[PDB]
Amino acid sequence: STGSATTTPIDSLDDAYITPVQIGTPAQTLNLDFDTGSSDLWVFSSETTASEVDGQTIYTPSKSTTAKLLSGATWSISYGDGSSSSGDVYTDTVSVGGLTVTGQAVESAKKVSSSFTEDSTIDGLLGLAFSTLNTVSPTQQKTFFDNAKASLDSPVFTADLGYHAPGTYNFGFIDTTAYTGSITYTAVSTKQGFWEWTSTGYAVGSGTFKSTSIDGIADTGTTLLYLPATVVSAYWAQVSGAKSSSSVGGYVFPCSATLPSFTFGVGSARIVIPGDYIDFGPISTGSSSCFGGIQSSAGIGINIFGDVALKAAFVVFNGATTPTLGFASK
Ligand SMILES: O=C(CCC1CCCC1)N1CCNCC1
Numbered sequence: 049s050t051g052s053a054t055t056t057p058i059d060s061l062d063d064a065y066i067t068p069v070q071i072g073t074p075a076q077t078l079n080l081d082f083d084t085g086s087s088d089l090w091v092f093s094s095e096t097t098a099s100e101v102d103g104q105t106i107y108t109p110s111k112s113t114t115a116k117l118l119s120g121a122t123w124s125i126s127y128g129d130g131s132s133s134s135g136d137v138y139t140d141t142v143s144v145g146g147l148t149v150t151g152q153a154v155e156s157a158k159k160v161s162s163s164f165t166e167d168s169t170i171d172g173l174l175g176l177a178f179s180t181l182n183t184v185s186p187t188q189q190k191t192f193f194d195n196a197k198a199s200l201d202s203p204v205f206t207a208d209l210g211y212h213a214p215g216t217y218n219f220g221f222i223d224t225t226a227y228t229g230s231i232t233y234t235a236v237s238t239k240q241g242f243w244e245w246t247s248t249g250y251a252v253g254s255g256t257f258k259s260t261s262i263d264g265i266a267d268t269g270t271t272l273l274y275l276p277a278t279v280v281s282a283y284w285a286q287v288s289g290a291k292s293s294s295s296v297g298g299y300v301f302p303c304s305a306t307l308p309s310f311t312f313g314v315g316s317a318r319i320v321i322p323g324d325y326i327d328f329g330p331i332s333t334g335s336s337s338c339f340g341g342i343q344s345s346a347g348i349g350i351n352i353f354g355d356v357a358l359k360a361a362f363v364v365f366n367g368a369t370t371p372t373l374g375f376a377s378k
């Protein structure tokens with residue numbers, strides 16, 4: 049089997065992307081944030097505290113003839129931006145882009161933190177990291193990809209995110225028309241539960257490539273690119289007036305600037321992030337100070353190849369017995 053679904057940015061600056069997911073019988077379609085950096089499929093629901101729902105579409109398990117309460121199971125997840133969500137668990141039929149999994153754990157939120165209530169366009173998350181990170185207790189549950197894997201034509205999914213435009217998540221096949229050149233594959237460590245890999249270095253604009261190992265995660269659920277402070281300083285030094293602001297929590301730059309590109313290495317291959325992908329717009333409405341898309345990871349503990357980086361590539365998440373990642377230009 050295979051599946052293919054379009055993923056759409058929530059706003060004009062790609063602050064997050066959403067993909068329609070069918071849950072239950074008859075289907076209830078929710079728009080979920082596909083997150084290769086976590087491993088829970090959780091949704092706003094009829095069980096979510098009413099004051100914490102503000103425009104999201106909810107899953108109502110009582111209206112699904114295939115829903116079954118997973119007795120005694122609870123979940124709780126805290127994310128690195130200070131947000132959180134928790135609740136109970138159903139199993140139900142879940143389909144993405146024509147690919148169907150029966151008995152998928154659907155984690156129904158009883159509580160969500162403000163950043164989730166405030167994101168009216170995101171009805172939940174669909175985790176695509178390794179199932180060892182799934183938070184369901186006392187019986188850990190498998191991700192949608194883990195459940196689908198054996199049925200897929202090939203045990204892979206691909207992320208093809210667009211810059212200020214829709215893109216595609218495919219399951220079970222590699223669309224050879226969706227990229228240019230060749231896909232370069234690189235080793236993955238699953239030891240921390242992530243699609244963790246080591247970039248071979250970077251370049252700023254037309255500058256020379258610096259060969260240096262940068263360990264980080266491929267995280268569709270992260271919007272920006274988080275790299276070591278040395279690398280980030282070298283990038284922003286090429287933008288007149290750019291500075292790290294203590295009030296903003298990171299690098300800002302004059303909105304009048306033209307940003308240089310940023311290149312990262314995948315083995316001997318190179319992925320070029322155009323400068324415009326690094327512009328996240330005014331810090332507040334009407335400001336001439338703009339949010340940078342490359343930020344320091346120093347306070348995170350790991351580097352994060354988020355959407356800023358991934359949207360410059362066609363990315364293969366190869367879930368074979370020994371997982372690997374593939375990157376191609378497009
Ligand atoms: O990219 C982030 C926060 C990333 C943080 C960096 C380190 C910890 C997490 N998003 C996506 C958009 N919704 C809010 C959360």
Ligand SMILES: O=C(CCC1CCCC1)N1CCNCC1
Nearest residue numbers: 085086125126127128181269270
């Ligand atoms: O903060 C995290 C980790 C989430 C934890 C790991 C699994 C359980 C919770 N991020 C940033 C946002 N994208 C996903 C990765």
